[PDB]
Protein: Thaumatin-1
Organism: Thaumatococcus daniellii
Amino acid sequence: ATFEIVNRCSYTVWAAASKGDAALDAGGRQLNSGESWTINVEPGTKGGKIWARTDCYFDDSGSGICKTGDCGGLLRCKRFGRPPTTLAEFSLNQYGKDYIDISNIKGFNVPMDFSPTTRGCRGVRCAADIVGQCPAKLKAPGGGCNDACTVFQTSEYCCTTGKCGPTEYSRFFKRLCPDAFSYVLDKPTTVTCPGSSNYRVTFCPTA
Protein backbone atom coordinates (compact mmCIF):
# COMPACT_ATOMS: atom_id res chain seq x y z
CA ALA A 1 0.00 0.00 0.00
CA THR A 2 1.10 3.60 -0.57
CA PHE A 3 1.14 6.28 2.08
CA GLU A 4 1.81 9.88 1.21
CA ILE A 5 3.07 11.78 4.28
CA VAL A 6 2.58 15.56 3.98
CA ASN A 7 4.01 18.23 6.28
CA ARG A 8 1.56 21.14 6.23
CA CYS A 9 3.11 22.61 9.48
CA SER A 10 5.03 25.90 9.25
CA TYR A 11 7.93 24.09 11.00
CA THR A 12 10.10 21.12 9.98
CA VAL A 13 9.08 17.69 11.28
CA TRP A 14 10.91 14.42 11.06
CA ALA A 15 8.32 11.83 9.89
CA ALA A 16 8.74 8.26 11.16
CA ALA A 17 7.12 5.01 10.11
CA SER A 18 7.62 1.70 11.94
CA LYS A 19 5.90 -1.59 12.87
CA GLY A 20 7.70 -1.73 16.25
CA ASP A 21 10.41 -4.31 15.47
CA ALA A 22 11.25 -2.89 11.99
CA ALA A 23 11.24 0.31 9.90
CA LEU A 24 8.43 0.82 7.36
CA ASP A 25 10.15 1.80 4.04
CA ALA A 26 13.11 4.13 4.98
CA GLY A 27 11.66 4.48 8.54
CA GLY A 28 12.23 8.22 8.75
CA ARG A 29 12.91 11.43 6.88
CA GLN A 30 13.11 15.16 7.37
CA LEU A 31 10.04 17.02 6.01
CA ASN A 32 10.33 20.78 5.60
CA SER A 33 7.09 22.85 5.48
CA GLY A 34 5.08 21.63 2.44
CA GLU A 35 7.21 18.55 1.67
CA SER A 36 5.59 15.18 0.86
CA TRP A 37 7.14 11.76 1.37
CA THR A 38 5.66 8.74 -0.42
CA ILE A 39 6.23 5.36 1.18
CA ASN A 40 5.39 1.78 0.31
CA VAL A 41 4.02 -0.41 3.10
CA GLU A 42 3.90 -4.17 2.45
CA PRO A 43 0.36 -5.69 2.30
CA GLY A 44 -0.58 -7.58 5.47
CA THR A 45 1.31 -5.10 7.75
CA LYS A 46 -0.16 -5.38 11.27
CA GLY A 47 0.45 -2.71 13.92
CA GLY A 48 2.02 -0.08 11.66
CA LYS A 49 2.45 3.46 13.01
CA ILE A 50 3.26 6.88 11.52
CA TRP A 51 4.16 9.93 13.64
CA ALA A 52 6.04 13.24 13.55
CA ARG A 53 9.12 14.12 15.58
CA THR A 54 9.90 17.74 16.47
CA ASP A 55 13.17 19.60 17.12
CA CYS A 56 15.56 16.95 15.92
CA TYR A 57 19.33 17.18 15.51
CA PHE A 58 21.02 14.38 13.50
CA ASP A 59 24.64 14.00 12.40
CA ASP A 60 26.00 12.78 8.98
CA SER A 61 25.37 9.07 10.07
CA GLY A 62 21.65 9.65 10.99
CA SER A 63 22.22 9.60 14.79
CA GLY A 64 20.87 12.29 17.10
CA ILE A 65 17.96 13.27 19.38
CA CYS A 66 14.38 14.63 18.96
CA LYS A 67 12.40 16.53 21.62
CA THR A 68 9.27 14.52 20.77
CA GLY A 69 8.88 11.02 19.30
CA ASP A 70 12.57 10.10 19.40
CA CYS A 71 13.09 6.41 18.36
CA GLY A 72 16.42 5.68 20.15
CA GLY A 73 18.33 8.54 18.49
CA LEU A 74 17.95 7.35 14.87
CA LEU A 75 16.78 9.31 11.80
CA ARG A 76 15.43 6.02 10.34
CA CYS A 77 13.17 4.51 13.01
CA LYS A 78 13.16 0.75 13.62
CA ARG A 79 11.25 1.09 16.93
CA PHE A 80 8.36 3.21 18.23
CA GLY A 81 8.97 6.79 19.35
CA ARG A 82 9.13 8.23 22.84
CA PRO A 83 5.86 10.02 23.93
CA PRO A 84 4.27 12.54 23.40
CA THR A 85 3.38 11.44 19.86
CA THR A 86 0.08 11.74 18.03
CA LEU A 87 -0.19 8.39 16.23
CA ALA A 88 -1.57 7.32 12.85
CA GLU A 89 -2.18 3.57 13.34
CA PHE A 90 -2.98 0.95 10.81
CA SER A 91 -3.45 -2.76 10.19
CA LEU A 92 -3.61 -3.68 6.50
CA ASN A 93 -5.31 -6.65 4.68
CA GLN A 94 -6.78 -8.16 7.85
CA TYR A 95 -9.35 -10.62 6.42
CA GLY A 96 -9.92 -8.39 3.34
CA LYS A 97 -10.15 -5.12 5.30
CA ASP A 98 -7.77 -2.28 6.32
CA TYR A 99 -8.10 -0.75 9.83
CA ILE A 100 -6.99 2.84 10.51
CA ASP A 101 -7.12 5.15 13.54
CA ILE A 102 -5.58 8.18 15.21
CA SER A 103 -4.53 7.66 18.81
CA ASN A 104 -3.77 10.04 21.74
CA ILE A 105 -2.93 7.03 24.01
CA LYS A 106 0.74 8.04 23.82
CA GLY A 107 -0.06 11.76 24.08
CA PHE A 108 -0.02 14.47 21.42
CA ASN A 109 2.68 16.48 19.74
CA VAL A 110 1.46 17.56 16.26
CA PRO A 111 -2.10 17.86 14.80
CA MET A 112 -2.88 15.24 12.12
CA ASP A 113 -5.33 14.09 9.47
CA PHE A 114 -5.30 10.41 8.40
CA SER A 115 -7.40 9.88 5.24
CA PRO A 116 -7.74 7.30 2.46
CA THR A 117 -6.74 8.49 -1.05
CA THR A 118 -8.76 5.59 -2.55
CA ARG A 119 -12.59 5.00 -2.28
CA GLY A 120 -14.62 3.16 0.37
CA CYS A 121 -14.16 4.94 3.77
CA ARG A 122 -13.84 8.28 5.59
CA GLY A 123 -10.71 9.82 7.14
CA VAL A 124 -10.02 10.71 10.81
CA ARG A 125 -8.56 13.86 12.28
CA CYS A 126 -7.18 15.32 15.51
CA ALA A 127 -6.44 18.99 14.72
CA ALA A 128 -7.35 20.79 17.99
CA ASP A 129 -4.71 22.84 19.89
CA ILE A 130 -4.06 20.07 22.47
CA VAL A 131 -0.58 21.47 23.33
CA GLY A 132 -1.95 24.99 24.09
CA GLN A 133 -4.80 23.61 26.24
CA CYS A 134 -2.70 20.80 27.88
CA PRO A 135 -3.31 20.35 31.69
CA ALA A 136 -0.21 21.56 33.65
CA LYS A 137 0.72 18.02 34.91
CA LEU A 138 0.67 16.54 31.37
CA LYS A 139 2.77 19.31 29.72
CA ALA A 140 6.01 17.94 28.30
CA PRO A 141 9.01 20.40 28.59
CA GLY A 142 10.27 19.42 25.11
CA GLY A 143 6.82 20.30 23.75
CA GLY A 144 3.65 18.31 23.46
CA CYS A 145 1.06 16.93 25.82
CA ASN A 146 1.79 13.58 27.51
CA ASP A 147 -0.85 10.94 28.21
CA ALA A 148 -1.48 10.22 31.93
CA CYS A 149 -0.03 6.64 31.75
CA THR A 150 3.41 8.03 30.64
CA VAL A 151 3.36 10.64 33.42
CA PHE A 152 1.89 8.74 36.40
CA GLN A 153 2.52 5.03 35.65
CA THR A 154 -0.64 3.76 37.46
CA SER A 155 -2.76 0.68 36.78
CA GLU A 156 -5.75 2.95 36.09
CA TYR A 157 -4.08 5.22 33.51
CA CYS A 158 -2.10 2.38 31.85
CA CYS A 159 -5.07 -0.07 31.96
CA THR A 160 -2.70 -2.72 33.30
CA THR A 161 -5.46 -5.05 34.60
CA GLY A 162 -7.49 -4.62 31.37
CA LYS A 163 -10.16 -3.00 33.62
CA CYS A 164 -9.85 0.78 33.58
CA GLY A 165 -12.28 3.59 32.99
CA PRO A 166 -12.07 7.07 31.46
CA THR A 167 -10.25 9.61 33.67
CA GLU A 168 -10.08 13.38 33.97
CA TYR A 169 -6.96 13.21 31.74
CA SER A 170 -8.40 10.93 29.04
CA ARG A 171 -11.60 13.13 28.99
CA PHE A 172 -9.45 16.14 28.13
CA PHE A 173 -8.00 14.38 25.01
CA LYS A 174 -11.49 13.02 24.09
CA ARG A 175 -13.12 16.49 24.47
CA LEU A 176 -10.67 18.14 22.01
CA CYS A 177 -10.38 15.09 19.69
CA PRO A 178 -13.45 12.79 19.85
CA ASP A 179 -12.29 10.86 16.75
CA ALA A 180 -9.01 9.68 18.41
CA PHE A 181 -8.45 6.99 21.08
CA SER A 182 -8.06 8.78 24.46
CA TYR A 183 -7.31 5.67 26.64
CA VAL A 184 -6.74 1.91 26.10
CA LEU A 185 -10.42 0.86 26.57
CA ASP A 186 -11.94 3.85 24.79
CA LYS A 187 -14.99 3.10 22.56
CA PRO A 188 -13.14 2.35 19.25
CA THR A 189 -12.76 5.13 16.68
CA THR A 190 -11.22 2.64 14.23
CA VAL A 191 -12.22 3.15 10.58
CA THR A 192 -12.73 0.07 8.34
CA CYS A 193 -11.44 0.53 4.78
CA PRO A 194 -11.41 -1.91 1.80
CA GLY A 195 -8.28 -4.10 1.88
CA SER A 196 -5.29 -2.64 -0.08
CA SER A 197 -6.46 1.04 0.16
CA ASN A 198 -3.96 3.98 -0.16
CA TYR A 199 -3.62 6.83 2.31
CA ARG A 200 -2.42 10.29 3.10
CA VAL A 201 -1.15 11.37 6.52
CA THR A 202 -1.13 15.21 6.82
CA PHE A 203 0.63 16.95 9.73
CA CYS A 204 -1.08 20.32 10.69
CA PRO A 205 -4.04 19.72 8.31
CA THR A 206 -5.70 23.08 9.11
CA ALA A 207 -2.70 25.41 9.84
Remarks:
- The domain at 1-207 is CATH 2.60.110.10 (Thaumatin).
